[PDB]
Amino acid sequence: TDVVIVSAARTAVGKFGGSLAKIPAPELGAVVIKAALERAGVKPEQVSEVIMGQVLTAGSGQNPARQAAIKAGLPAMVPAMTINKVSGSGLKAVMLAANAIMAGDAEIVVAGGQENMSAAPHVLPGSRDGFRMGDAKLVDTMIVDGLWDVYNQYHMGITAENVAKEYGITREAQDEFAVGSQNKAEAAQKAGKFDEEIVPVLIPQRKGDPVAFKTDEFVRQGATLDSMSGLKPAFDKAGTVTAANASGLNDGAAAVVVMSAAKAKELGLTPLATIKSYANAGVDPKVMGMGPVPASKRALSRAEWTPQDLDLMEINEAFAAQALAVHQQMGWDTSKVNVNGGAIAIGHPIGASGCRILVTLLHEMKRRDAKKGLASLCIGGGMGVALAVERK
Amino acid sequence: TDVVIVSAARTAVGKFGGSLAKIPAPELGAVVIKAALERAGVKPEQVSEVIMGQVLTAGSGQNPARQAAIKAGLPAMVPAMTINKVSGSGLKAVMLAANAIMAGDAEIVVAGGQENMSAAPHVLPGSRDGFRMGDAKLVDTMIVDGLWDVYNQYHMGITAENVAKEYGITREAQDEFAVGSQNKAEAAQKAGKFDEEIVPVLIPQRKGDPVAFKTDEFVRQGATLDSMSGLKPAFDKAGTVTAANASGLNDGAAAVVVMSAAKAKELGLTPLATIKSYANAGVDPKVMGMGPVPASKRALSRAEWTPQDLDLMEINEAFAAQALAVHQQMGWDTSKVNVNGGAIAIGHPIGASGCRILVTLLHEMKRRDAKKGLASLCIGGGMGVALAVERK
Amino acid sequence: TDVVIVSAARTAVGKFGGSLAKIPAPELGAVVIKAALERAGVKPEQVSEVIMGQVLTAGSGQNPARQAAIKAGLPAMVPAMTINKVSGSGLKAVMLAANAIMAGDAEIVVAGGQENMSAAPHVLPGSRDGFRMGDAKLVDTMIVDGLWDVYNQYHMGITAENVAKEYGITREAQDEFAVGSQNKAEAAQKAGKFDEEIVPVLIPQRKGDPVAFKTDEFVRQGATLDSMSGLKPAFDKAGTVTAANASGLNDGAAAVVVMSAAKAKELGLTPLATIKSYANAGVDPKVMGMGPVPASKRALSRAEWTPQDLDLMEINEAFAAQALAVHQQMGWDTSKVNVNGGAIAIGHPIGASGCRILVTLLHEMKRRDAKKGLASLCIGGGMGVALAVERK
Amino acid sequence: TDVVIVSAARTAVGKFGGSLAKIPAPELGAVVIKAALERAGVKPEQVSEVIMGQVLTAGSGQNPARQAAIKAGLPAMVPAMTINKVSGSGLKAVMLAANAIMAGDAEIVVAGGQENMSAAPHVLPGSRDGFRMGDAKLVDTMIVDGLWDVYNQYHMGITAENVAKEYGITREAQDEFAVGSQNKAEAAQKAGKFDEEIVPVLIPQRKGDPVAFKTDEFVRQGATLDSMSGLKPAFDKAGTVTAANASGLNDGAAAVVVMSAAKAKELGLTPLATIKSYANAGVDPKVMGMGPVPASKRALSRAEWTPQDLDLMEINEAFAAQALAVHQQMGWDTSKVNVNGGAIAIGHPIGASGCRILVTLLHEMKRRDAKKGLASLCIGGGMGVALAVERK
C-alpha cells in the first residue's frame, strides 16, 4: 500500500526565552494537529492515531502526545503515543505512521513533533534518598536529556568537533555555511515562502486579547561573515564550533496527516506527496552528526534513487560542522539543500525538527514543482533518519 | 507474511526502594535485551531495531532505549527508540515492532519496556527563569508523569473508584480478587513456574560478591481476606480502593524478540508463538481502567476469534476494581486469566508491565499447551492495548 | 564615659535586582568600613572591633562581619562579629559599640550593617533526610528570615494592616505620607544633601571601566498622590498597604566610627555627635510597627528629653501605616522627621537600615546645626530600638 | 560595678542525626533559657534582654534568639538579639551581656547559644535570577557557614593541619589527647558530674509520652589508643587530623543568667561566680586554632592573674592539634584543663559551645571549691574569646 501525506503545518519557531516560552509543548502540538487536520479536510473523528515526538518531558504530565491530541479537540476514542528518538523524533513519528498504515493497523495518522526547550526544568537526582553531607547538583534536563552524550559524557558540540577534525571541516567553512543558512532564510521570509506553512499561535496577554505569533523570530537579518568570524569557540577553546555556526535552542511544533493512497481517493483528497522510502541508521556516538549519511543512503537504496536524482533536500543543521561533512560524504548538489535556510537560522526545537523540515520540504517542492525530495537528521547517541517523498 | 515471537525474558520485579532501587531503568532493559537475544539464538549484529518503553525519563539521559541497547551489547549500527504510552508502553513496543516487520521496514526487533519507579526524581518547574519572590515547588516526577490524570487532575486510583462505581465492583469482590492474585502468585513461586522466564540481576554489595536478584519480592505469601478487610481506602474516605487491592510502585523490565516467520525459518529458529492480531483503543480518561475492553474486542475481531476461543489470558491488574470490570464486560472464563497471579502480587513497573505480562503469558502457554492467548492493559489518560498470540 | 561618633558613611541604596544586586553584602560593608575610617582619620590597626548587622546570611560564608572587615583592609588582629536583630541590626550594632566602650572593653569600634536582599537564595528544608513522595517546598530565605512573622505565620505587611486597623490609618493617609517621603527625598537629591554621606560603589561593566553607583535609585521622581492611588494592596487583598506605601526590598550598607570622647580628644578628632542615650523595647509581634513608641519613650526618658526637645528625627518607614501610627502616638512635630525622605523613597536594606538612617540623621543635623536628634526603627517579631544623639 | 552569674544550664549534646535532630535550635534555646531562669529564681518578666548565639540560620525564621525567648515563656516585652561569632558565639554572648550591665543598659540578661547542625539545610544560590542554561549547585549550609574558611577557601580541618605543622604537634600526640578526652568524659559521666548542669529535652515519641534526652550521647565509652591509631587522615593525605582527634557535628544549647552583684543582692540570690574579666583577639585565619592564646593572655592581663593563678580551665577542643598547641604556648597545668573531658568526646554544637564549656566550668568549680577559672575558644576566620570568673 502506497502511503501519502495529505497536509502539513508548523508553528513559527520561537527563540529561547521568546514568544513561545510560556506555551507548553502539548499546546503547541495541538495547534499543528488541529491545523493539519483542517487543511487536509479530515474531521477529528476520522483519525486512527496520533504519534508526537517530544524529547524533554520531565514534569510534562502523562503522555504529552495524548495531551496535544485532546487539546486539539480530538475525541477520547483516538489513541496517542509519545516517542523519543531525540532530534529524529519528529520524522520518526511519520515513519511509524507509515508502518502502521502499511500493516493495516491504522487508516489515518497525525504525526509530528513538539518541543518547548525554554520551559525545560532542572532535576534533583537522588532527591528521595536525601543528601547527608556536602554539595548536590541540580541537573539541567534540557542538557542531560537533549544535548549530552551518555556514552562519552560530553556535549553534542564536542561530537561536532570530532566530526570537524575527522572530516577536515574548517572554522571558515562552517562560518560560510552558517551565513548561507541565515541569508537563505532571510530571503525566503521576505519572499513570503513561509507564509503558507506557518500556523499562528495565540499568545495570552496580561491585558486585552491574545496576539498571534507567526514569524520565525530566530532568523538573523543582514547576517554577515564578519559577524561570525570574531566569536570564540563554545565547547573547546581551540575548537571551531560557535553559537553562530550551530543551531539554537528553540520552541515549536510541526504535524502532517498521513493515510493510504486509497483512503485519500475515497475521501476525495489531493495528496501533497507520496512517501517513497525511509530508513534509520546507527553510527558511533562520538560522530553522531554523520547519522544522515548511512540513513540517507539506505532510504535512497530503498527508493531506487541516487543522490543525483533528488530535486530538493532538507538536511537538519544541528552544527555546520556535521552538515558540511554530510554533504561531502553524500556528493549531492548542495544548491538544492535547505534552499530556504535551515536550523542555524530558523532554530531547532529538538523533538519537532524532524517534522518541521519535512513541512518546509513539502511546501517548497510544490512551489518549484520538484518531484523527488528527501529529509534527513542526525541524532544524539549516534543515529540518523531519512525519509524520501515523491510528487507525480 | 506473518510475525513471530522467538523469545521472551523478564527481570524479577522489585518493590519500591527494594533490590532494584539503585539500578537505572536502561540497565534493567539491557539485562532483558541481552537475555532475550541469547535465548532466541540471535547475534547482536542481526538486530534491526530496539524499541523500549520507559515512562519516567527525567534526567535519564539521551534516549533511554539506546542506552539499554548499548548496555546490552548491541553495536552502534543498531538504532533504538523510546516510547511512552504509559502502562501500555511495553506491549505497544511489540505492536510497533510488528508493524515494522509487516511493512518491511525491519527484520529482527527487540521490543519491550523498562522502569525504575524508585529512582524517579523530583523536578523544579521554572528553574530556568528563577523565582523572584516567593516559595517554589519541587514536584515528584513519578506522580506527575506516571500516576496523575492530566485532564481531571487526580490520581489513577480515583479512575479506579469511578470504574468500581460504574460497574458495581465491591470492596469485598476487589479484596477476594487481590487475595486470589497473591495465592496464585505464591503457588507459582513455590512451583518454580517463573524459573524459566526470569533473568537474574546482579546487585553490587557493600562488600563481597554481587547477589543474584531473581524472585518477585512484592508477592505476599499466605495472604488472606482478613489481611485486607480492615485496611482504609487509599484515595478516598468513602472509596473501595486500598493499597492491598491495587498494585504497587515497582521496578523491572521485560523484552521479546520479534521477526518475520520467514526470517525465523532462515535462521533455523523455532518461534514461541505467532502474533495473531493487536489493537489499541481510547476511552474517557475518567474510566481508563476499561481500555482493555474495546482494545481486546478489536484485537479479537481482527483475529476472527471469540472471547470463548481463548485458552489463556494476561490482563494487567493495575487495580482490582478495573480488572474485575473488564472481566465482567468481556464475559470470558476468569479461571484462564492471570493463572500465575497478576500485578497486585508481582508488581507494576509502568513502562515494562505490558511486555512483562506477555512474557509470563508465553511461558505458561507452552507449559499448558495453550493455543490461543491474549495480553491486554489499561493506560492512564484513557486508552487500552491488546495483543493476541497463537501456537501451533 | 561619653561616647562619640566620629564619622559616618553609607552606600547609595540599590533597587531590588538593581545596581548592587551582584555585590555580596560583605563587599558592601567593606566599602563603608573603609570610608568611615578614612573620614575619621583612624588607621585600620587602631580599631578594636567591628560589629556589623546582617539578617540574610544563608550561604554567605563564616561571619559576614569579619568578611567585611578583612575586605576593607583591616588586619586579622581586629576581631569582628555579625549580629541579627532584623531591621534593628544596624542601630543595635552602634548600641553594642557604645556598651563596649563604656565598659572599657573596646576603644574604637566600627559599627553598622550590610544587606543584599537581591542575592538571598532559596533554601531546601529537610534536604538531609530526602523526600519520600509528593511535592516538596523551596523556601525563599528573604521572606522566611526577613519578612515573615514566626509567631503568627504571616508577612510583616499584615502586621502593618493590623496597625492601620488599630490606629485608624486610612489608605489615603498612607498614600499622602508616601508622597511626602518621595517628594522630600527628590528635593534632597536635587539639592545635593546626600552628597557628603554617600560613598560610591564601583560596578564592573561588560565593556570598559567600572561605573560609580552613588545615587539612591529607588527614589520615585515627580511622585504625586495619583502615582500612589493606582496600586492594589500587596499583602492583604482587602487591606490598605501597597508596594507604593511600604518600603522596598533593597541592597546597601552603612557604618559609623565610635569611640570615647577622651579618645577622640587624644587623636584630635572633632566628633559629629555624642551618643546621649539608647534603648530597646518589645511589643506584641502582631503590631511590631509600634515598637518605636516604647523604645523612643525609653530613650528620651534616659536622655531627660521630651519629644518636643527634639530638633530632628529619623524614624524608619517600613510601612506608611506604622510610621503614621507612631507619629500619632508620640505627638512630636512631623516636619522634623525624615526631612530628606525615608525608606519608602530611599529603600530598606534590612540589616543596614538602622545605621543608614543614623548616617542620614547625623549629616542633616550637621547641615542645619540641629542639636538634639533621635533615630528609631520597628523590628519584626515585636521590637523597637531608639538612639538619641546630641551636638554641642 | 561588678557583674555576676547567678545560674547556668545546658542540654545534653546530641550526635549528628541523633536525639535532637528534629528539634529546631530555638527550641533547644528555649529549654535552657527557661531552666536557667528557674535555677536562678528570676522572674521572666524582669529580664532586660536575651542574647543567643546561633551560626546556622538558613530558613530558621526571624531572629532565632527571640524565637527561643518566646518559646521559653518570656513575655513579648523582653527584647532578644541573635549573634554570630562562629564558635565564639556562645561565650561572646556572655561578654555582651557583661558589657551591657556595666554600661547601665541592662540589669538582668540571659545569654548563651544554640545550634542544630543536623537540621542545617541546603541552599540554592542564584535561585532568584534562575539558571538559564547549565547545572546549579545545592550548597550545604553547615559546611559553608560553619566549617569553611572564606579567605583560604578550605575546611577548618586544614587550619588544624597548619597549626600542627607550625607548633610540631604530631598525630601520636593528637591521638593520646583524644583518648584522654574520651576517658575523662566517660569518667565524669559515670561519676554523675554532668547531672546537675544538664536539663532534659523531652523527645516526642510515635506513641505515648515523650522520652527525656539527658546524656551526652557522642562520648565514646571504652575508647583506646588502638581504636584511633589506624584511622586515615580526614583532610590531608600527609596530615595528622582524623575524625577521632577532632570534634563532631553536634546539636545543643546552653545559657547563663547574668546581672549586677547589686541586683542579685537585692533579689536575695546567691551568685555562682563573678565575671573577673574577658577579652577577644584576632589572628591569621590560616591558624585560627591559636585564637585562645592572645585572648586568654589578654583576659588574664585584665584580671591581673598569671596562668599559674588558675584553678580550672575549659579550653574548647575543636581539634586536638589546636588544643595541644594552645597548651604548649600558655604553659599552664593541663591537669586542670577540661578535667571532665571536652569537645572531642562531648561534641561541638558551634553556636552553643562557648556557653556550654562555661556551664561545665562553673559546675565543676563549685564541686572543687575552685576560686579562679577561665574559659576560652578558637573561632573560624581567625579569632579567639576568653572569659575569667572568680568565686570567693
Which among A57, A124, A82, A122 has a CA at the least distance from the CA of B145? A57
| Phi–psi pair at C77, nearest 5 degrees | -65, -10
Spatial neighbors of D195 by CB under 8 A, at least 6 apart, are none
The C-alpha cell that represents A78 in the structure block: 483516538
Q: In angstroms, how far apart are the furthest CA atoms of chain D?
A: 68
Q: Is A371 left (phi over 0), alpha (psi -120 to 50) or beta?
A: alpha
Give the list of residues 6+ apart from residue A165 with CB closer than 8 angstroms, or none: none
How many residues can be counted in chain B? Answer: 392
- Say how many CB pairs under 8 Å bridge A and C: 21
H/E element, C202? strand C201-203
Kindly give, in sequence order, each residue whose CB lies less than 8 Å from that of residue B87, ignoring residues fewer than 6 positions away. Answer: B55, B316, B318, B348, B350, B351, B353, B354, B377, B378, B379, B380
Which chain C residue shows the shortest CA-CA distance from B155? C134
Q: How many Å lie between the alpha carbon of D102 and the closest alpha carbon of chain B?
A: 44
* 3 state SS of A200: coil
CB B134 within 8 A of CB B261: no
Q: How far is D384 from D23, CA to CA, in rounded Å?
A: 29
Q: Does D151 touch chain A (CB under 8 A)?
A: no
Question: In the structure grid, which three cell numbers stand for residue B162, read together?
Answer: 469511578
Q: Are C159 and C287 in contact (CB under 8 A)?
A: yes
Chain B residues within 8 A of A283 when measuring between CB atoms: 76-77
- CA atoms of D243 and A132, how far apart (whole Å): 17
Do residues D185 and D340 make contact, with C-beta atoms less than 8 angstroms apart?
A: yes
Is residue B81 within 8 Å of residue B141, measured between CB atoms? no
Residues 6+ apart with CB under 8 A from B28: B11, B20, B68, B114, B115, B116, B201, B251, B252, B253, B352
Q: Is D240 on the interface with C (CB under 8 A)?
A: no
Residue D127, chain A, CB below 8 Å: the answer is: no
Which amino acid makes up residue B38?
E
Residues D378, D142: Cα–Cα separation, whole Å? 18
Cβ contact B126–A121 (<8 Å): yes
Alpha helices in chain C (DSSP H): 25-40, 64-71, 89-102, 141-142, 156-167, 171-190, 225-229, 261-267, 292-303, 320-330, 343-346, 353-368
Each residue of B372-387: b (16+ CB within 10 Å) or e? bbbbbbbbbbbbbbbb
Q: Which chain A residue shows the shortest CA-CA distance from D134? A: A140
**Residue D309 amino acid letter:** D
- Which strand (E) or helix (H) includes residue A83? strand A80-84
- Which grid coordinates are listed for D304? 591581673
- Quickly count: other Cβ atoms within 10 Å of residue D226's Cβ: 9
D99 phi and psi angles, rounded to 5 deg:
-60, -50
Please report residues of A whose CB lies closer than 8 A to that of C132.
128
Q: Which residues of B touch D136 (CB under 8 A)?
A: 127
The half-sphere exposure of C88 on its side-chain side, counting CA atoms within 13 A, is: 34
| CA–CA distances in Å: residue A157 to residues A32, A162, A216, B385, C295 | 30, 9, 24, 40, 64
Amino acid at A160: A
What is the distance between the alpha carbons of residues D82 and D57, in angstroms, rounded to a whole number? Answer: 10
Asked if C136's CB is within 8 angstroms of A133's CB, the reply is no
CA-nearest residue of chain B to C123? Answer: B135
Contact assessment for residue B367 and residue B270, using Cβ atoms and an 8 Å cutoff:
no
DSSP category for residue C117: S
**Are C1-122+193-275 and C151-192+276-389 equal in CATH topology?**
yes
Mutate to test the interface with C, among D16, D78, D81 (most CBs of C within 10 A): D81
Q: Give the CB-side neighbour count of residue A136, counting CA atoms within 13 A.
A: 24
Q: Enumerate residues 6+ apart whose C-beta is below 8 A from B204.
A: B210
The rounded distance, in Å, linking the Cα atoms of A213 and A21 is: 12
Q: How far is D133 from chain B (nearest CA, A)?
A: 7
Query: How remote is the C-alpha of C54 from its chain's centroid?
Result: 11
Distance of CA D302 to the CA centre of its chain: 23
Q: Are C32 and C253 in contact (CB under 8 A)?
A: yes
User: Of B36, B29, B20, nearest to B65 (Cα)?
Assistant: B29
Contacting residues of C for B137, CB less than 8 Å apart: 135-138
Question: How close is the nearest chain B Cα to the Cα of C46, in Å?
Answer: 42
* Percent of chain B as helix, strand, coil, to the nearest 5: 35, 25, 40
List of long-range contacts for A331-338, beta carbons under 8 Å, 24+ apart: A331/A307, A332/A307, A332/A308, A333/A308, A336/A310, A336/A311, A336/A312, A337/A312, A337/A313, A338/A181, A338/A184, A338/A313, A338/A314
Three-class DSSP labels, C255-299: EEEEEEHHHHHHHCCCCCEEEEEEEEEECCHHHHHHCHHHHHHHH
Which three cell numbers mark C308?
518636643
- Smallest CA–CA distance, residue A74 to chain B, in Å, is 11
* Tally: H helices and E strands in chain C: 12, 15
Cell numbers describing residue C63 = 561571619
User: Which of these, C376, C165, C157, lies nearest to C281 by C-alpha position?
Assistant: C376
**Considering Cα of C36, then C42, then C44, then C47, what sign does the dihedral take?**
negative
- D80 DSSP assignment: E
Amino acid at A282: G
CA C195 – CA B240 distance, rounded (Å)? 75
Of C122, C134, C139, the CB nearest to B140: C134
Interface of C with D in 268-287 (CB under 8 A): 278, 280-285
Q: Record the cell numbers describing residue A69, joined without a space.
A: 491530541
Q: CA–CA separation, C159 vs B353, rounded Å?
A: 56
Nearest-angstrom CA–CA distance, D124 and A131: 14
D134 interaction partners in chain A (CB closer than 8 Å): 140, 143
Q: What is the C-alpha to C-alpha distance for residues B11 and A386, in angstroms, rounded to an integer?
A: 35
List of E strands, A181-304: 198-199, 201-203, 211-213, 250-260, 273-282
Q: How far apart are CA B101 and CA A18, in angstroms?
A: 42
Q: How far is residue B216's CA from residue B358's CA, in Å, rounded to a whole number?
A: 16
> Which is nearest to C161 in space by CA: C250, C87, C238?
C238
Pairwise CA distance, residues B327 & B338, whole Å:
12
Pairing of strands A108-116, A49-53: parallel
Give every CB contact of residue C206 below 8 A, 6+ residues apart in sequence: none
Name beta bridge partners: A273.
Answer: A5
| Residue D158 CA: distances (Å) to CA of A76, C91, D246 | 65, 36, 12
Q: Is B382 on the interface with A (CB under 8 A)?
A: yes
Separation CA C188–CA A308 (nearest Å): 78
CB contact under 8 A, C130 and A133: no
CA distance D228 to D258: 41
Q: At residue C381, what are phi and psi to the nearest 5 degrees? A: 95, -5
Here the cell at position B201 is 540481576
Q: Quick one: DSSP state of residue D71?
A: H
Task: Find chain C residues with C-beta within 8 A of D15's C-beta.
Answer: none
List chain B residues with CB under 8 Å of D133: 128
Could you tell me which residues are beta bridge partners of residue C376? C315, C386
C185 three-class SS: helix
- Smallest Cα distance from B24 to chain D, Å: 21
Q: Does A134 touch chain C (CB under 8 A)?
A: no
Q: Identify the bridge partners of residue B83 per DSSP, sorted by sequence position.
A: A83, B53
Q: Return all residues near D385 (Cβ < 8 A) that are at least 6 apart.
A: D85, D88, D91, D92, D95, D278, D279, D280, D281, D291, D292, D295, D354, D376, D377, D379
**CA nearest neighbour of B84 among B117, B52, B59, B50:** B52
A111 CB-side CA count, 13 A: 28
Distance CA A181, CA A188 (A): 11
The Cα A365–Cα A391 span in angstroms is 8
Rounded Cα distance between C25 and C130, Å, is 31
CA D362-D367-D368 angle, to 5 degrees, is: 95
**Angstrom distance (rounded) from CA B35 to CA D308:** 79
Beta bridge partners, A379, equal A383
C151 close contact with D: CB closer than 8 A: yes
State the Cα–Cα distance between residues C154 and C156, nearest whole angstrom. 7
Is some CB atom of chain D closer than 8 A to the CB atom of B134? no
> Phi-psi bin for B382: left (phi > 0), alpha (psi -120 to 50), beta?
left
Please give the DSSP secondary-structure letter assigned to residue C143.
I
Q: How far, in Å, CA of B164 to CA of B153, rounded?
A: 19
Distances (CA, A) of B30 to A390, B11, B98, B211, C30: 39, 10, 21, 18, 58
On whether the CB atoms of residues B372 and B305 are closer than 8 A, the answer is: yes
The residue of A122, A131, A133, A135 whose CB has the most chain C CBs within 10 angstroms, and thus the best one to mutate to test that interface, is A131
Q: Do D61 and C145 touch (CB under 8 A)?
A: yes
Tell me which residues of chain D, numbers 56 to 95, contact chain B at a CB-CB cutoff of 8 Å.
none
* E strand or H helix at A171: helix A171-190
Sign of CA dihedral B328, B333, B335, B336: negative
A130, C127: Cβ pair inside 8 Å?
Answer: yes
C321 SS3 class: helix
* Domain at C1-122+193-275, CATH homologous superfamily: Thiolase/Chalcone synthase (3.40.47.10)
Rounded distance between C-alpha atoms, residue B360 and residue A176, angstroms: 58
Contact predicate B340/B187, CB 8 Å: yes
CA distance A229 to A206: 41
Q: Where are the alpha helices (DSSP H) in B223-349?
A: 261-266, 292-303, 320-330, 343-346
Distance separating the N- and C-terminal Cα atoms of chain A: 17
Instruction: Give just the sign of the alpha carbon dihedral A26, A27, A32, A34.
Output: positive
CA B128 to centroid of chain Cα atoms: 35
What is d(CA B359, CA B374) in angstroms, rounded to the nearest whole number?
A: 12
Give Cα separations from C190 to B122, C221, C301 (angstroms). Answer: 53, 10, 37
**In this structure, which amino acid lies at residue A30?**
A
Q: Between chain A and chain B, how many beta carbons pairs sit less than 8 Å apart?
A: 202
Residues in A touching B87 (Cβ below 8 Å): none
- Provide Rg for chain C, Cα atoms: 20
Query: Nearest CA to CA, how far is D64 from chain C (Å)?
Result: 9
Cβ within 8 Å, pair C283-D76: yes
Cell of A329: 560524504
Contact A84 B83 (CB under 8 A): yes
Of B265, B276, B215, B249, nearest in space to B343 by CA: B249
Which residues share a beta bridge with C331? none
> Residue B245 corresponds to which cell in the numbers above?
487491592
Among chain C residues, CA nearest to A127: C130
The class that CATH gives domain C151-192+276-389 is: alpha beta
* Cβ within 8 Å, pair B280-A49: yes
Burial of residue D367 (number of CB atoms within 10 Å: 0-12, 13-18, 19+): exposed
User: Strand B122-124 vs strand B136-140: parallel, antiparallel, or unpaired?
Assistant: antiparallel
Grid coordinates belonging to A207 = 491585558
Cell numbers that stand for D273 in this block: 561566680
Beta strands in D98-245 (DSSP E): 108-116, 122-124, 136-140, 148-149, 154-155, 201-203, 211-213
Strands B201-203 and A198-199: unpaired
Residues pairing with C10 in the sheet: C198, C254
- Domain regions of chain B by residue span: 1-122+193-275, 151-192+276-389
Cβ atoms < 10 Å from Cβ of C81: 29
C58 with D58: CB under 8 angstroms? yes
User: Residue A262: left if φ>0, alpha if ψ -120 to 50, beta else—which one?
Assistant: alpha
Alpha-carbon distance of C273 to C259, in angstroms, equals 11
- As given in the structure block, the three cell numbers for residue A129 are 534518598
Which one of B84, B86, B151 would you mutate to disrupt binding with A, by most A Cβ within 10 Å of its Cβ? B84
Tell me how long chain D is. 392
A142 contacts D134? CB cut-off 8 A: no
Give residue B281's Cα distance to chain centre: 17
- Joined together, the cell numbers standing for residue A306 give 541516487
Could you tell me where the DSSP H helices lie in chain D? 25-40, 64-72, 89-103, 141-142, 156-167, 171-190, 225-229, 261-267, 292-303, 320-330, 343-346, 350-368
Residues 6+ apart with CB under 8 A from A295: A279, A280, A281, A376, A383, A384, A385, A386
